[PDB]
Amino acid sequence: FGRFTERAQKVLALAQEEALRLGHNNIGTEHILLGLVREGEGIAAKALQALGLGSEKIQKEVESLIGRGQEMSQTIHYTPRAKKVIELSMDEARKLGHSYVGTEHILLGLIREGEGVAARVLNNLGVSLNKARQQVLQLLGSNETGSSAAGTNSNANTPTLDSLARDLTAIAKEDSLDPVIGRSKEIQRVIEVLSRRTKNNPVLIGEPGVGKTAIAEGLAQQIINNEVPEILRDKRVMTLDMGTVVAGTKYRGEFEDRLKKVMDEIRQAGNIILFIDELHTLIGAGGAEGAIDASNILKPSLARGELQCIGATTLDEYRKYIEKDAALERRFQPIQVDQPSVDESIQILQGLRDRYEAHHRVSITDDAIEAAVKLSDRYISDRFLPDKAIDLIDEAGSKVRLRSFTTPPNLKELEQKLDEVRKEKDAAVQSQEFEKAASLRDTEQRLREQVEDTKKSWKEKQGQENSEVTVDDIAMVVSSWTAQTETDKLLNMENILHSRVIGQDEAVVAVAKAVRRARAGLKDPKRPIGSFIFLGPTGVGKTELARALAESIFGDEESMIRIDMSEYMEKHSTSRLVGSPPGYVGYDEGGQLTEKVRRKPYSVVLLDAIEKAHPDVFNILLQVLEDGRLTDSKGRTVDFRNTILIMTSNVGASELKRNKYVGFNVQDETQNHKDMKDKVMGELKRAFRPEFINRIDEIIVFHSLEKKHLTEIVSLMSDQLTKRLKEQDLSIELTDAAKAKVAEEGVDLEYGARPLRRAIQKHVEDRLSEELLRGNIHKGQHIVLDVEDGEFVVKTTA
Template sequence: MSFFNKFSKNAREILDASFEEANLLNHYYVGVEHIFLAILKIENGSVYDLFKNYGFNLESTRMEIIKKVGRGKVESYVDGYTPRAMKCLERSYKHSLLLGKKEVQVEDIAYSISYERESILEEIMESKINNFEEFRMNLSKNKKIKMNDVKENDSNYTNLNKYAIDITKYAADNRLDPVVGRDDEIKRIIQVLLRRTKKNPCIIGESGVGKTALVEGLAKKIVSGKVPKILKNKRILSLNISNVVAGSKYRGEFEKRLNGILEEVKLANNVILFIDEIHSIVGAGGAEGAVDASSILKPSLSRGELQIIGATTISEYKKYIERDSAFERRLQPILIDEPKINKAIEILFTLKERYENHHRVRFTKEAIVLAVNLSSRYINDRFLPDKAIDVLDEAAAKKRMEFNETNNKTIIYENKLREIRIEKGNAIKMYDFEKAAILRDEERNVIEKIEEFKLDEVVKEEKYIKVDANDIEKIISEWTAIPVSKLEEEETEKLKNLEILIKEKIIGQDDAIKSIASSIKRSRIGLSSPNRPIGSFIFLGPTGVGKTELSKVLTLILFGSLNSLIRVDMSEYMESHTISKLIGSPPGYQGHEEGGQLTEIIRLKPYSVILFDEIEKAHKDIFNILLQILDDGILTDAKGRKINFKNTVIIMTSNLGAEKFANKKFLGFMEDINSKGYENMKQIMFEELKLFFKPEFINRVDDIVVFKKLKINDIYKITNILLADLVERVEKLKIIMFITNEAKKYIGDIGFSDIYGARPLKRIIAKHLENKITEMILNELLSEGDILKVSLVNNELKFDVEVKNGEG
C-alpha cells in the first residue's frame, strides 16, 4: 500500500532518486537505505539545513552507507520497494496527517527513517548526531508528536478491520503464493479499474482456475509499484459478506454494518473492495421489509464512490448476477479460463518450493508433470491448477506420514517399558528377585530400542523425502478408484492370461472373449484413445448363451467384486420420459436434486463395467444419450455436470434376430460351430441390427459380437462349472460332497434347452440338488463332517451319506 499521490513534488523527486540509487548499486529492490541516500544528495531545504546545523557530513555518510549495504555483482532491474521501505513511507504519510499537512514533505520521510529500529541507518545516525532525540523533534517541527502516535487510526476503520482482510498487507509481508502465467488477465483487471465508468471488474471462472489468485497477483503488483500511477496508493481489502450478515438479529442491523463499511471506504479514499463469491450479495441480508446488499452497493457504484472487484463461477453469475440487470450493468465481466496443461505445469513448478518446505519433501520433475496430466485426465469434476495442487499436496502428506511411522513404534515400546517397570516394582515388593532381574534385563533392551527409534526419528526429521511419480499415481488411484499406476508384475500376468481366465468361466464363446480381452489390454497398456470408453460392445445371440454372464465374469476378474458391475435393465426405459431416470430430472421437476441413476453411480465409481441389458427394448431417444457416451466418453447430466465415462467398459446385449432361430435348426449348425449355419445366423442378426439401429450408432461401437448357439458338449462344461460352485458352497458348511460323472451328465441333459440355452441349468440344479441337500440338513440326515456322494441309479439321482467317524 503506497501513498504516492499524497507526496509533494520534492518528496516524489526523492522517491524517484531512490530508484536511481538502487540502480547505481546494482540492487533489484529499493530499501530504506536507498531513500536515505537520495535525501543525503539534496543541497537545499529544511532537511539539508538541519543536517548542517548538527554537523552532519552528508557525503561521508553516503560513502559509509554504500560501504555497509554493498554493491550488486551484476546489473539488475529494480523491482520495487521492500516491505520495510513501504512501511517507512506509510509512517511518513501518517505523520503528515497528524501534523495536518495536505502533502507528505521530505522532512516527514526523514523523520520516519529516523525511527528505523535495528538498522544500519539508526546505527550511523546515532553515532554522528550528539542529541539524536532533539534532532528528531526538529525534523517533526512539533515536539508534542512522537512516532508512537503515528499509528493507523483503527477507531476510524472499525468495520473494515472487523469484516475485511487487507490483501495488500499480506502481499507486503510476503504471505501470498506467487502468481504465474496470468499477466494478461491481471492487465485486463487493471485496464477495467482505470476506466472512467463501469470500473468494477467481475472475474468469472470455474472453481479452482485461480480467480482469487488474480486479485492476489494484483495486490503484489500494487505493493511493488508495478501499476499505473492512479493505482499506486490503492489497498485491496477482501470483504466477507457472510461475516457481515452473521449475527445481525434485528431489522436494519445488516444495513447499518454495510453502510458503515461504505462510509469507511469513502473516508479512506484508497480502498478497492474484493468480494469473493459476489453472487452471495444478491439477496444477502434482504429479510422481509429490508433491502439486500446489492441494492445498498448500487448507488455508491453508480456515483463512483466505491470500487469493487468481484469473483464468481459462470453458473452462479448467470443464476444470480444476470437476474439483477441493474447490478450487472455496473460490473465488467472478465472471463477466466482453466489454464492449459503446460501453463498448469509451470504454476506447479513455481509453487513446489513452498509445499516442499512445508512437508519437508522434494518433488521430482516427473511427479509434478504427472500430477497435472493425471488430474486433468481422471479428475473431471474439478479444474486446473487447483486439482493438481491438491494431488501434489496430498502425495507429500502421505509420504511424510509413511516416513514417520516409527513414531508409532516408539510409543508402543514406551508403553511396554512402563508395564515392565510396574511389573518389576511388584516383583521386588514380593521379594521375587529372580523375576525382577529378568525384567531388569528386558527393561534395558526396551530402552535401547527406544533410543534407536528416537535417533532414527531425528535423522528422518532432518532428511527431505523424495516424492516421485509412483506417489502421485497412488493418490490419483485413491481419489478415483482407477488403477493408473504402472503395471505390477501380478497384474501383468493377469492381463497376459485374461482370455484364459475368462474361458474358465465362459464356454463356447471364443470370439467374444478375444474381442473384449483385447480392448482391456489396449487400455491398460495405454494405447487406446483417452477420449472414449475403454471398450464398447454389442453382444448379439439367442438367450442363455452367456452374454450377461461374460459381463459378470469380466467384472470379477478386473475388480474382484460384482459391486463394479452397473446393470441397467433397458426394459425400464421404454418410454421417452424415462430418459430423465438416467441423467436426472430437469430443474423444477421432482427428483432434480437427486441426480440420474446412471450418472450418479458413474460419478462415484468411474471405473466400472456398464451392462445395458436387452438394449432393443429401450426407447429410441435413449440411443442419443448413448451416442454421446460412445463418441466423447462424456455425458452431461441434468445439473450441467460433465460425467466421465472414459474409464468404463460399455456392454450392450440384444436378442435381435434370435427369435428366428428359436424353432429353426440351420443345416449343420449344431454339428459344427464354424459351418455355414453359424455364418447364416450371424448375417441375419447383423441385418436385423442395421434395421433397428441408426448407422451412426453402430459405427461408434468398437465391436459387434454374435454369440454362438451352445452345443450339448458346451452344456456339459457349463454344468461342471456350476456344480463345482455348488460343491464349494456345501464345503463351507463343512460337508464334503462328490458328484459322479454320470450324475453330472444327467444334470446337463435335463438342463439343456435348444431354445433357452444354458439358462434352465441353474434352475435344474436348484430343484434336483440344492433343495434335496437343504431338506437333508434340516432333517439332520446330513451334518458337519459328513461325506455326501451324488450318483445316478436307474436314471435318478441318489444321495448317499457317509457319517463322520465316532458317530452312528
C-alpha cells in the same frame, strides 16, 4: 513438530554432556538446567546469566543434589521430566513465534516444567523460577517478518476497510504468498474492465475448480506492480468475506443491515477495489430462488464504481446477473479464465512436493509427480488436473512411508520381541515372581534399548520411502480411488476379467484390451474408459463381465451401476413394448441415471439390453461417448470421462436362432456367431443409431452360450456354494460330473448364461438342503454331488 532451530537442540545436547559428566543415567532436570546456561547466550542461556546464575553457580547446586553420584550413564537419553521440558518448550515457541523452536522457549518451557532438580537449583541460587522465564520473555520477541511500526496514515478509508475484512496485498507485504501458478490470462483482462467506469466491474467466468483465490493472488500482485493506470488512481484491494457477516447473527435481516451499511461506506470510490466472491448467491436473480437478493443494493453500488468490483461467477451463474439490469447487466461484462496446462499442472505439484518435508515420502520424484497428473485424468477424472495430482503424491506419500515400518529389512521384529517381554516382565512383577520378573525385565530393557537404538537405524525407514515417490506409489493411490496397483490390473486385465467371466472368453479379452488402452492413458480424456455394445443374448457372459470389470479394474466389485435400458425406450415405447410409456428421457436426465453415476464416478455402468430402446436414447449416451460428460439435472455436469459404460443388447437374442456352440463345431461358434452378428448388425443400427455406434468405442460380440463356458460358470457357482457353506462348517462339492449336468440348462438361442444360477440352485442349494433334512449329509462331511446314472447321486466321502 519436526525440525527446529539449533539453539533449542543445542541446549538439549548440553544436557547430554551433563548426562555423562555427572553420570546421571537418565539425564535429569539438573542436566537440562546446566544445558541452558552452558549455551551461554541465546535467550534461555542469557536469561539465567542475567538473574545472576552462571553455569558454575548452577552446577555447584546441582552436584549438591545428585553429584557424581552416578557415572555409569545408563541409557543416557532423557528423563520423562526432561522430555516434558521439551514438550513444553515446543509449545513455548508455539506461544512465542518459532515453529522451528529455539533455546529461549526451552528456558521458558523449563520454568513451566519447574520440577525437582532444575527448580531447586535456581530457587536456592536466589532466582525465582518466573524471574528466569520473565527474563527470557523481556529479551524475546521470537521470530517476526515484515512487521515493525514507525508510522501509518489515516484517510477516508478508515470506517470502510475495518469491518469486513481481508487484503491479499497485506499478507503479501508480509509475504508467504504463492502466485499460485498461472492462471495468468484472467489477470490482465480484469484490470481493463476494472479501470473502466461505466462498467467499473470485471466479471470472471469459469473454472471453479481452479482454486479461484490462486487467480486472485495473481491479481493482487499485478494490481500493485505496475500495469495499473491513473484510471485506477490510488486503488487498493479488499476481499469480501461472507463468513464474518453471517457469524454472530441468526437472521437474514441483520446480515442485510450490515451489508447496507458497508455498501454506503465503499463511498471511498475512485480509490477502492472490492473483490466479491460467489457473486450469484447475493444477486438472488430469477428462477425458483436465486438466493439472497443483495442485488438491489449491489446494482447502484456496481454502477457507481463504489463497488468497483470483481465478480466471480461460473457458466450457469452468469444468467442470474445478466437477467438483472441495467446496473447488473450494465455492470457485468465477461473475461476468460485459464489454468495450468496438463504438464504445467505437474509443475505446481513439484513446487510443493519438495516442501512436503513436514510430509515425508514426498519430497521428489518427477516421474511420480507426472504420474499423479497423467494417471488421474482418466482415473477420476472429474476434478482439476493438478488438484487430483498432489493428493496422489501425498497418499502414496504415506502409504509407502507406512511400508517402511513393516519392511525395513523386517526389523519390525525387534519391537515385537520388546513387546513379548513387557508382557512377561510386567505380569511377572504382578504375580511376583520377583527375580523371575527381574530377568524378564532385564530381557525387556535389552529389547527396549535396542528398539530406540534401531529406531535411529530406522532412518533407513526414511531412506526407503522419503524419495521413493515413484510412479508406482502414485498409481496405487489413483487405483485406490478408482504402476503399482494399476499395472497388474493392466497387464493381466483379460486374465482378471476371465477370472470372473468364463461365459464368453472372446468378450473378456476384447473388453480387457479396450480398458487397457484407456487405463494406460491411450484414449481421449473426454470420453469414458469404455463405451461398448455387447451383442448376443442376455448374460451369456455379459452381466458377469460388468461385475468382473468392477472386480478387475478397481479392485472393488462394489463399483458397478446397472440400469435396464429396455425400460427407457423413449420411442420404442410400444414399438418394442416393455410396459413403461411415460417419463423416459426425463427419468434418465431428471434424476435416476445421473444421480447414480455421481455416487461412484468410476463405475461400470451396465445398461441392460439396449435393443429395445429407440435410437433416440443413444443421443444422450452419445454425449458420454463424445464429451465424456452428460449434461443433466440441477445444472450438474457429470464427467463421464471416467466410468466403464457397457451396454448390452438383445440385438443378438431376438434375431438369434443360430447357435454359437463349440459342440456343433468350432465353425458353429464363429459362423453362427457371424450369422447372428449380421442380422444383429441391422438391428444394432435400428435400435441405436449408426452415429451412436460410430462414437461407441467397440462392438463386443457374444452370441448364444458356447459349449464350453457353461460348465465353467457352473463350476464357479457350485464353488460359491462350496465356499459359503464351509464358513459355517459344511463341506459340499459338486464333482465335475455334477457341475456338468447343471451346466446343460443354458445353451440357448436367446437366453445366455442366466439360467445357470437356477441350475446351481436346484442341483446344489436345493439338493443339499433336501439331504440335510434327509440325514444323508452331516456337519462338515464332504457331500459329493456326483452324477452316476445321468442324475445326481449323493455320496459321502468324508
